[PDB]
Amino acid sequence: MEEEEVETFAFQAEIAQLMSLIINTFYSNKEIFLRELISNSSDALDKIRYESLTDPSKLDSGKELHINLIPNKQDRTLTIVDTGIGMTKADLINNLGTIAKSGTKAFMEALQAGADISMIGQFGVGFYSAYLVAEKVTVITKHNDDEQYAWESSAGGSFTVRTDTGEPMGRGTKVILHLKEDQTEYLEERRIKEIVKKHSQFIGYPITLFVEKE
Ligand SMILES: CN1CCC(NC(=O)c2cc(-c3c(O)cc(O)cc3Oc3ccc([N+](=O)[O-])cc3)on2)CC1
């Protein structure tokens, strides 16, 4: 029998409030969740690109800087993979839920008052837009300085972090959105292409959509 250690963390209170607001309120324009993922991937890819200019060995773990979109209609997941700089364990714990974000309160107030959900990116809390469409999010990540880790949450106020025993990634971050049953349009090729074209046209890294043959 294998033994695996898990650590469970509480979300910072306002982040938990925001997650409940995002999950339990209807919003139109939920398609912007993908813009937010691609934008975060692009930022991570920038980080490794710049780091590699001085230290080409930081690319030992993979030279290609790109984003892959992987819809899976069998398990109702949409996976966004990038070969950006990746996150350490401490980064996941800190950056994905335990540390307050200065934009969370302002954003909840904006939203309450009728701001379009598209505004979320501006408030620095765009990652949480995943919960517009997903009931559960898993973030698997590998930084050159750390082992591969998995973060996961179904909201409800906690997340977990564990060493990832799944398929090794060279470097980068994979976000797996377990979509809500009414949000399966985001597994369709045409819809994904539509929303990438509408919202993610100036990503300066290649993006490839992988479509399972029907
Ligand atoms: C010290 N650490 C600091 C963090 C550095 N890594 C990254 O920035 C990073 C981000 C991602 C990264 C990613 O490649 C895709 C994503 O969809 C989300 C990511 O991380 C984020 C986590 C939180 C937030 N947020 O809430 O604002 C935004 C992005 O992968 N690597 C690595 C060095």
From Swiss-Prot:
Changing D82A: Impaired ATP-binding. Strong interaction with HIF1A, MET, KEAP1 and RHOBTB2. Loss of interaction with HSF1 and ERBB2. Los of interaction with TSC1. It is found in: Nucleus; Cytoplasm; Melanosome; Cell membrane. The modification N6-acetyllysine is found at K47, K73. Residues 1-214 are annotated as: Interaction with NR3C1. ATP binds at N40, D82, K101, F127. Transmembrane segments: none annotated. Signal peptide: none annotated. Belongs to the heat shock protein 90 family. This is Heat shock protein HSP 90-alpha. The chain holds residues 12 to 225 of 732 of the full protein.
